[PDB]
RNA sequence: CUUUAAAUCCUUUAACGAGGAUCCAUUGGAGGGCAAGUCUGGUGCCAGCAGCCGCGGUAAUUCCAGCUCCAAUAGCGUAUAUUAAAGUUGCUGCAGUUAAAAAGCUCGUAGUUGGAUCU
């Protein structure tokens, strides 16, 4: 899993880069 | 190990029941992702077709929960699609994957002119709903693909329809709505009476009846 | 369910409602498949053979698995008459 | 609003020459070399997330 | 007020076969809701019908066998030649292995495959699956 | 007015999504596997196999017994059995449905040059017929898209000019052998 | 409801004519006062003599001068404002020469922080904005 | 040589012609949409980018550059018109309670549409 990826989201989830994380965690 | 609760998972766990479409025939609830694993857990792949932040408004600040769609399937004529919302992205999404596997429908496939070989597209045009996004399906000539936007097209290339048109309706943007729609479209298929499934209905033994004697001595 | 061949290609063949002959869908959790149990003629004991009725959840939920089960079973000589 | 900084930024940025690197190839041979990248040999995959620039 | 007795009849058999009755009353009756009732009951969708003879004008009671999905009328009755047949049937009907398009037609009111087998148009009365 | 033809046509459609990471990933396996040089070259076995596709289809909403539809499938599964796509036991308007487009693609001029053993890779392949090494029959062929006949199949050699089939050391051999 | 009958074709045909008009689209392509307004006077470019410089301050939520031109087109006479896209390249045009100007890209609408502005410059003094970025040409003296 | 009035071009010989085969492939981009780097340096709500949402106020994945990557490729970008996408003109096939919307209400001509029935 990763979990970079879902915790950079759960640390900014409207960040500006959260568009990014929650697409490559698509998939 | 799986230690079932349930009648049914004790049933499939002893090897008493043959298939998952002896579940379906009676439309029993499946309450144990095992079982699932146990019949078609060597060809089911998952796909996580959306992570999407909720929040709710607190006194101080917003909370945040994630919502992870999961579309499950083997290739093969089963299809499932599971919601489910977590404090965390890796259990929202665990508790999808679940969720999806608890969901898998059986997905009937048909012929679009002649019949040679095995079916590879829809029985007939078949349209699911789910809050104003309207998705529907209409069987495509053989070598077609699937004519669809990609969100239809993963999880009927997950029901293991080859060669499908699609026409969509609504707010297609509201990602949950559109799988939603697409999986309860795909369900259809088999629910949708047709000329070849009019011959009278020979009832068998069910499950809790054929194999009373060893859930009793269990 | 048949092709070109003659080989029979569907997954599995679902009931039907014996009050409605629609299909009963894989996921109708309220829908029964009632057992009937069939009685000797002199004894009036049980035999051990049954009449098996399906009722999707759509009859049973506008009431009408009552009435539908009562003419599946008169018709099949369980249930008298008046 | 002034005029006055226009090229700023741009005039401004120490001039850093391009690199002298060898041609790379043109055609089929660059499809080719594609083709090889991400279809032939393949190792590190093993169930992460890897893409063709990452710098970590 | 009324138009279509056609309509109507084919309305209130969809409705009753979507509410699961076994039987429905259609009235008034006519020579064009018999025809299509014959091509419906000779492909097993509705079963046998009575016509109560009234003195005014027909009544009908349809006993309802549950495989009729779907039983519509057009309105109006477009002219179809036999090179547009496709297109009707392709926007009419779930499947190319099953359901019907009616057509009243110079050799009677019959569906769109037995149209074809006689190599004639008409126009589109409705269709059922 | 003049004495020419102004008859053109495309013979490719550009995808309408253009970056998709499963087609894209199609499209460079085909490209790698068939020794192409650019994805208009897909395109354009794409868009033959559609066309196929297309009369196919409408051929098969005729009736059985229709003369067009007799002759014209007649004709379309001639054609495909011709250039060894379609096999001849398959000679009914539904096998076209079920073609691939790499059927198309193993009856160019450059894979039967690599699979009949005459080169070392495809892209040797393709580098001999550009460089006129090969010929059909008795024409030297330079064509790598050049579609094989059945029939011409077994009349693939290499060229009784090249200095692989026949004599004439090229520039370099040459060259050297002056040289020492 | 709408009309189904074998005879309504006129209505049919009518009430569509007559409901395009109440498309923005459309009534902006077919009712010629567009065309009238539109400086180009439906041309993809045009010409004109660069009347100034201009700083145009961006939109509230974005703070910056962006460095467009006053020209005007040689084709009609009529004032435009036109943005010079790159950075410096305001320093490539000057006063009183001609610049080849197209539009900005939403067909007549202002784009993104430049408000009121809905053109672009492409070419000064007969040779690209690119060209002269990139170092590839040099202005004509 | 051939071609052609005559030529050119293509084809055909022959001679020379490739190892940074320097006989050098570009045009756009790399936050999302949408394929591809929260790598390095600079700038610091400036300059600029950005079709849209947005980026820039000292760790800028978005600007200016270097490296790398990827999209098409002898082609690629931009403006504009137009078609599909648009079931946002709806005949197929849209809407009208509250999102835009049913005339204040009736009559009423043209128009449109009109019940069963005749081997």
């Given at each position: 899993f990763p979990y970079e990826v879902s915790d950079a989201l759960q640390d900014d989830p409207k960040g500006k880069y959260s568009k990014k994380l929650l697409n490559k965690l698509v998939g | 190990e799986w230690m079932p609760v349930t009648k049914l998972g004790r049933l499939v766990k002893d090897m008493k029941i043959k298939s998952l479409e002896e579940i379906y025939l009676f439309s029993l609830p499946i309450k144990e992702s095992e079982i699932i694993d146990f019949f078609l857990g060597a060809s089911l792949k998952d796909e996580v077709l959306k992570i999407?932040?909720?929040?709710?408004?607190?006194?101080?600040?917003?909370?945040?929960?994630?919502?992870?769609?999961?579309?499950?399937?083997?290739?093969?004529?089963?299809?499932?699609?599971?919601?489910?919302?977590?404090?965390?992205?890796?259990?929202?999404?665990?508790?999808?994957?679940?969720?999806?596997?608890?969901?898998?429908?059986?997905?009937?496939?048909?012929?679009?002119?002649?019949?040679?070989?095995?079916?590879?597209?829809?029985?007939?045009?078949?349209?699911?709903?789910?809050?104003?996004?309207?998705?529907?399906?209409?069987?495509?000539?053989?070598?077609?693909?699937?004519?669809?936007?990609?969100?239809?097209?993963?999880?009927?290339?997950?029901?293991?329809?080859?060669?499908?048109?699609?026409?969509?309706?609504?707010?297609?943007?509201?990602?949950?709505?559109?799988?939603?729609?697409?999986?309860?479209?795909?369900?259809?298929?088999?629910?949708?009476?047709?000329?070849?499934?009019?011959?009278?209905?020979?009832?068998?033994?069910?499950?809790?009846?054929?194999?009373?004697?060893?859930?009793?001595?269990? | 369910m048949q092709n070109d061949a003659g080989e029979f290609v569907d997954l599995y063949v679902p009931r039907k409602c014996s009050a409605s002959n629609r299909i009963i869908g894989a996921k109708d959790h309220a829908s029964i498949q009632m057992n009937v149990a069939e009685v000797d003629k002199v004894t009036g004991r049980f035999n051990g053979q049954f009449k098996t009725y399906a009722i999707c959840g759509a009859i049973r939920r506008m009431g009408e698995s009552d009435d539908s089960i009562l003419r599946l079973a008169k018709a099949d000589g369980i249930v008298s008459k008046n | 609003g002034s005029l006055a900084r226009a090229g700023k930024v741009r005039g401004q940025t120490p001039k850093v020459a391009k690199q002298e690197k060898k041609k790379?190839?043109?055609?089929?041979?660059?499809?080719?070399?594609?083709?090889?990248?991400?279809?032939?040999?393949?190792?590190?995959?093993?169930?992460?997330?890897?893409?063709?620039?990452?710098?970590? | 007020?009324?138009?279509?007795?056609?309509?109507?009849?084919?309305?209130?058999?969809?409705?009753?076969?979507?509410?699961?009755?076994?039987?429905?009353?259609?009235?008034?009756?006519?020579?064009?809701?018999?025809?299509?009732?014959?091509?419906?009951?000779?492909?097993?969708?509705?079963?046998?019908?009575?016509?109560?003879?009234?003195?005014?004008?027909?009544?009908?009671?349809?006993?309802?066998?549950?495989?009729?999905?779907?039983?519509?009328?057009?309105?109006?009755?477009?002219?179809?030649?036999?090179?547009?047949?496709?297109?009707?049937?392709?926007?009419?009907?779930?499947?190319?292995?099953?359901?019907?398009?009616?057509?009243?037609?110079?050799?009677?009111?019959?569906?769109?495959?037995?149209?074809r087998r006689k190599h004639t148009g008409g126009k589109i009365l409705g269709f059922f699956f | 007015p003049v004495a020419r033809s102004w008859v053109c046509r495309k013979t490719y459609?550009?995808?309408?999504?253009?970056?998709?990471?499963?087609?894209?990933?199609?499209?460079?396996?085909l490209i790698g596997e068939y020794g192409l040089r650019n994805k208009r070259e897909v395109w354009r076995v794409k868009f033959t196999l559609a066309?196929?596709?297309?009369?196919?289809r409408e051929l098969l909403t005729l009736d059985e017994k229709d003369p067009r539809r007799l002759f014209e499938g007649n004709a379309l599964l001639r054609r495909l059995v011709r250039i060894g796509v379609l096999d001849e036991g398959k000679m009914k308007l539904d096998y076209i449905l079920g073609l691939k487009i790499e059927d198309f693609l193993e009856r160019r001029l450059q894979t039967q040059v690599f699979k009949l053993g005459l080169a070392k890779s495809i892209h040797h392949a393709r580098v001999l017929i550009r460089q006129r090494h090969i010929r059909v029959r008795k024409q030297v062929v330079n064509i790598p898209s050049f579609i094989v006949r059945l029939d011409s199949?077994?009349?693939?050699?290499?060229?009784?000019?090249?200095?692989?089939?026949?004599?004439?050391?090229?520039?370099?051999?040459?060259?050297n052998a002056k040289k020492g | 409801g709408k009309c189904?009958?074998?005879?309504?074709?006129?209505?049919?045909?009518?009430?569509?004519?007559?409901?395009?008009?109440?498309?923005?689209?459309?009534?902006?392509?077919?009712?010629?006062?567009?065309?009238?307004?539109?400086?180009?006077?439906?041309?993809?470019?045009?010409?004109?003599?660069?009347?100034?410089?201009?700083?145009?301050?961006?939109?509230?939520?974005?703070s910056a001068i962006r460095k467009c031109v006053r020209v005007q087109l040689i084709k009609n006479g009529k004032k435009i404002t036109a943005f010079v896209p790159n950075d410096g390249c305001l320093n490539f045009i000057e006063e009183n020469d001609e610049v080849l100007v197209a539009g900005f890209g939403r067909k007549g609408h202002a784009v993104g922080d430049i408000?009121?502005?809905?053109?672009?410059?492409?070419?000064?003094?007969?040779?690209?904005?690119?060209?002269?970025?990139?170092?590839?040409?040099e202005r004509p003296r």
């Open positions: - | 999407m932040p909720v929040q709710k408004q607190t006194r101080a600040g917003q909370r945040t929960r994630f919502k992870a769609f999961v579309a499950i399937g083997d290739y093969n004529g089963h299809v499932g699609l599971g919601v489910k919302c977590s404090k965390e992205v890796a259990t929202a999404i665990r508790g999808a994957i679940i969720l999806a596997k608890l969901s898998i429908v059986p997905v009937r496939r048909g012929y679009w002119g002649n019949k040679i070989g095995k079916p590879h597209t829809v029985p007939c045009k078949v349209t699911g709903r789910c809050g104003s996004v309207l998705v529907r399906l209409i069987p495509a000539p053989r070598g077609t693909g699937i004519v669809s936007a990609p969100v239809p097209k993963k999880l009927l290339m997950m029901a293991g329809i080859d060669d499908c048109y699609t026409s969509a309706r609504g707010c297609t943007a509201t990602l949950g709505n559109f799988a939603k729609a697409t999986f309860d479209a795909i369900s259809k298929t088999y629910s949708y009476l047709t000329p070849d499934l009019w011959k009278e209905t020979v009832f068998t033994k069910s499950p809790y009846q054929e194999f009373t004697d060893h859930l009793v001595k269990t | - | 790379k190839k043109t055609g089929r041979a660059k499809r080719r070399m594609q083709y090889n990248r991400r279809f032939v040999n393949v190792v590190p995959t093993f169930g992460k997330k890897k893409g063709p620039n990452a710098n970590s | 007020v009324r138009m279509n007795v056609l309509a109507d009849a084919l309305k209130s058999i969809n409705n009753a076969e979507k509410r699961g009755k076994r039987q429905v009353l259609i009235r008034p009756c006519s020579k064009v809701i018999v025809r299509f009732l014959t091509v419906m009951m000779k492909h097993g969708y509705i079963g046998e019908f009575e016509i109560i003879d009234d003195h005014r004008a027909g009544k009908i009671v349809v006993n309802l066998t549950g495989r009729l999905n779907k039983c519509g009328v057009i309105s109006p009755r477009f002219d179809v030649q036999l090179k547009d047949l496709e297109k009707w049937q392709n926007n009419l009907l779930p499947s190319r292995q099953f359901g019907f398009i009616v057509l009243t037609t110079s050799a009677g009111i019959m569906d769109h495959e037995e149209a | 459609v550009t995808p309408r999504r253009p970056f998709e990471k499963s087609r894209l990933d199609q499209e460079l396996k066309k196929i596709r297309k009369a196919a199949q077994k009349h693939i050699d290499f060229s009784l000019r090249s200095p692989y089939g026949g004599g004439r050391p090229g520039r370099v051999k040459r060259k | 189904r009958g074998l005879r309504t074709a006129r209505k049919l045909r009518s009430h569509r004519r007559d409901q395009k008009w109440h498309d923005k689209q459309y009534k902006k392509a077919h009712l010629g006062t567009a065309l009238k307004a539109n400086p180009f006077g439906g041309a993809s470019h045009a010409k004109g003599i660069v009347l100034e410089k201009v700083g145009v301050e961006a939109k509230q939520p974005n408000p009121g502005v809905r053109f672009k410059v492409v070419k000064v003094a007969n040779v690209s904005l690119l060209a002269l970025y990139k170092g590839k040409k």
